[PDB]
Subunit: 102 residues, 3 copies
């Protein structure tokens, strides 16, 4: 399986996007939590509150998930970071595989 990390400007957009992803079953679940971001943007260091999202899904769904997030994301250049899971308990992996599209 894989973990996908992305960030949103607010709770409204984060919740809307994540719910759509769940409805389309591109992910089995998401963990949302606030954070403060500091980043470079056109010659200036920006500071913004964001809602970070940890999405969990199947490895084979990466491409489709990434594309969908791109179409739904409020940011023009969002962060869609994929981290492969080296191992996970099989009983959980089963639930995840079962709850994701196939």
């Amino acid at each position: 399986m894989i973990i996908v990390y992305t960030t949103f400007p607010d709770w409204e957009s984060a919740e809307k996007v994540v719910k759509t992803l769940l409805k389309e079953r591109l992910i089995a679940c998401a963990n949302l939590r606030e954070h403060r971001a500091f980043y470079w943007w056109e010659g200036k260091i920006e500071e913004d509150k964001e809602v970070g999202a940890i999405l969990k899904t199947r490895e084979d769904l990466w491409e489709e998930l990434k594309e969908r997030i791109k179409e739904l994301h409020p940011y023009d250049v969002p962060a869609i970071i994929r981290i492969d899971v080296d191992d996970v308990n099989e009983d959980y992996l089963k639930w995840l595989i079962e709850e994701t599209k196939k």
Copy 2:
């Protein structure tokens, strides 16, 4: 070393489990913070407040740690995710090894 990510339904269970893992020297430490979870569960997209836990330990302790968490976890199907650390400062690694059993 490795990082292990798991979630709990509340702070009570999260603390109990983490402290048990520490007393048994299966992990060097943990980072816990709340998050809003959205997931599929028997035909419904559940929304709940959870406590996410980031555990740090040695690679050779993974299996034993995974099985121990399965026994202690309040969730019937908990997420026990392993992510290998590609590199880390040496002093921290040495500290982590000294803190974990064997």
Copy 3:
């Protein structure tokens, strides 16, 4: 690209360090959020509020970044954890590499 995870004792140090790393373009950005750390100290399990920081940068900047964090960090034995990113949207990766030193 890679993600580097470290923790700080407070927001003052977290933001000062992160802003310095950005100014020197060792990272493209960072996400900071509080958490509760659990670890052994003085013979017992201690709980401490910390500010976790997720930094995003290029793989080739790892060594320089790690050494810089060591020089700036308030902790004597800080956690400087590198986790390689398996995949990421390429428009974000293009942005990230163009904002970091070289």
